[PDB]
Structure 1
Amino acid sequence: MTEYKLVVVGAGGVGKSALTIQLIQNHFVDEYDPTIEDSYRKQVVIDGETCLLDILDTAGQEEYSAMRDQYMRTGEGFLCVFAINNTKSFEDIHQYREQIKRVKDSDDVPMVLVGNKCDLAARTVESRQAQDLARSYGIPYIETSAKTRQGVEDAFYTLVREIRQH
């Protein structure tokens, strides 16, 4: 089996923990419990190959931002998550992307831009804006909903496949 190290990063409240918990347990959390650092392991079959996904849920708050360097050094793939109903969170993606780029010392870092909370109608980040951002990064953009499970498997498995292209 093949082991893939994924790191889920983004601004606080965008739903990183909700997405990870939805993927692991097929359950949606409606409570906001701020994260510091969480580790999950999941056995999955992607494209006929048995993978162990080691998912690391990071903290989106301004605190515990000194722990970024270590996990941005260890992880292989990165889910950069923002909320379509949070313009500021979308504007926060560039800081994470630049930190990953400088720590990895590479422009080609496996990443997927994730627009979470697509089930909500209070959209302030249009799909084409995130598409333009992703095109500048040269990475896929996928909309997900941790509430309805829409796009969660797509986002995670696309990140795995992006890791595969390296």
Structure 2
Amino acid sequence: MTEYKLVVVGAGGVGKSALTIQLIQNHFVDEYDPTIEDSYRKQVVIDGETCLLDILDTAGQEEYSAMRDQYMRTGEGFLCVFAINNTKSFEDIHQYREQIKRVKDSDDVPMVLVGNKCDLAARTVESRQAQDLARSYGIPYIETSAKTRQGVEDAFYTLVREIRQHKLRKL
């Protein structure tokens, strides 16, 4: 299999861990605080296939890339765990990918915007604005929920869809 050094970004008020944890631990913890920090190593199943992946959780208690700054050197793909119920992180995403493209190398890395807890209704962040910003970074806006693990798979599979796809489109 291949390794997909993933990296999570966005506010911690959205559910940064729960999304990573789920996709890896495969279970919900709803206990991860906005300070812990660890990488989840485990292969998954991409478009019906599979690829060794490693999603970093990233902490907060700082400002932006000050939390997950120790792995950006290999940041293979960044997943924006913003919640459609907290535009806050949302404003924080544009700033997140901003620092990313800086540490990585350029401003065209494989990342995807996702509205976590989309299950219920609510939506402090305008839905139109969610896809809109996704078009700004060139990434798609997937709406999932770390609790329903329903979109979480297409959230981490879309980001890799950008990575895992390059290896071939190359030619």
Q: Which runs of 4+ in 1 moved over 6 A?
A: none
**Deviation of residue 74 (structure 1)?**
1.4
**Deviation of residue 32 (structure 1)?**
5.3
**Deviation of residue 65 (structure 1)?**
4.8
Give the conservation status (yes or no) of the 8 Å contact 1:10–1:60: no
More strand by share: 1
Is structure 2 residue 74 aligned with structure 1 residue 74?
Answer: yes
**Cα distance in 1, alignment partners of residues 98 and 65 from structure 2:** 14
**Cα distance in 1, alignment partners of residues 133 and 64 from structure 2:** 26
- The CA deviation string for residues 26-81 of structure 1, in whole angstroms up to 9 with x for no partner, is 32223352233211111223245441111111013326853544322211100012
Give the conservation status (yes or no) of the 8 Å contact 2:44–2:52: yes
**Cα distance in 2, alignment partners of residues 97 and 71 from structure 1:** 14
Give the conservation status (yes or no) of the 8 Å contact 1:12–1:61: no
Give the conservation status (yes or no) of the 8 Å contact 2:110–2:163: yes
Give the conservation status (yes or no) of the 8 Å contact 1:11–1:92: yes
Give the conservation status (yes or no) of the 8 Å contact 1:85–1:120: no
**Cα distance in 2, alignment partners of residues 15 and 130 from structure 1:** 16
1:63/1:88 Cα in 2 relative to 1: closer, same or farther (>3 Å)? closer
**Cα distance in 2, alignment partners of residues 118 and 48 from structure 1:** 24
TM-score normalised by structure 1 residue count: 0.89
Identity %: 100
Give the conservation status (yes or no) of the 8 Å contact 2:115–2:144: yes
Give the conservation status (yes or no) of the 8 Å contact 1:82–1:89: yes
Give the conservation status (yes or no) of the 8 Å contact 1:43–1:50: yes
1:122/1:74 Cα in 2 relative to 1: closer, same or farther (>3 Å)? same
**Cα distance in 2, alignment partners of residues 151 and 83 from structure 1:** 13
Give the conservation status (yes or no) of the 8 Å contact 1:144–1:155: yes
1:31/1:165 Cα in 2 relative to 1: closer, same or farther (>3 Å)? same
- The CA deviation string for residues 66-120 of structure 1, in whole angstroms up to 9 with x for no partner, is 3544322211100012111112111111111110112223121111111111123
- The CA deviation string for residues 127-158 of structure 1, in whole angstroms up to 9 with x for no partner, is 21011101111111111101111201101111
**Cα distance in 2, alignment partners of residues 40 and 65 from structure 1:** 18
1:66/1:22 Cα in 2 relative to 1: closer, same or farther (>3 Å)? closer
Give the 3-state SS of the residue equivalent to 1:113 in structure 2.
strand
Task: Give the aligned CA root-mean-square deviation in angstroms.
Answer: 2.0
Contiguous gaps of at least 5 residues in structure 1: none
Give the 3-state SS of the residue equivalent to 2:50 in structure 1.
strand
Aligned length: 166
Give the conservation status (yes or no) of the 8 Å contact 1:11–1:61: no
